[PDB]
Ligand binder design. Sequence first.
Ligand SMILES: [Cl-]
Ligand SMILES: [Cl-]
Ligand SMILES: [Cl-]
Ligand SMILES: [Cl-]
Ligand code: NA
Length: 129
Amino acid sequence: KVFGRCELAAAMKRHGLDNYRGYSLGNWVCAAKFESNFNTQATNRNTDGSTDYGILQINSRWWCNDGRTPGSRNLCNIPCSALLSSDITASVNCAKKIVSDGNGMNAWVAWRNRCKGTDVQAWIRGCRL
Ligand SMILES: [Cl-]
Ligand SMILES: [Cl-]
Ligand SMILES: [Cl-]
Ligand SMILES: [Cl-]
Ligand code: NA
């Protein structure tokens, strides 16, 4: 599924991301836009042989099992294919673990580079939240 911006905002809100670890919802919508283009199906291979999955581009090195990332962890206890579902529940739950890990949303390169320090409230403008 390719979410619309406010559609994704609402989904992320219902699943508990708004202000989660102090990151307002716009941070999460922003990060998703530049991670995945709001596409739950997005995958992008990394140099180290891991892959990022889903709307929030969660990495198989630490977070999900994709069966082809040797000596990785699966801290979210999920297959990485769970992260590609039109339903973003698994992605959101895993994102909550990630952002709790020490490094906050710096875990997501697109967030650090495109969202951190920006007017992320813009990403939830217009949405009925
Ligand atoms: Cl698995
Ligand atoms: Cl959803
Ligand atoms: Cl933080
Ligand atoms: Cl916001
Ligand atoms: Na893994």
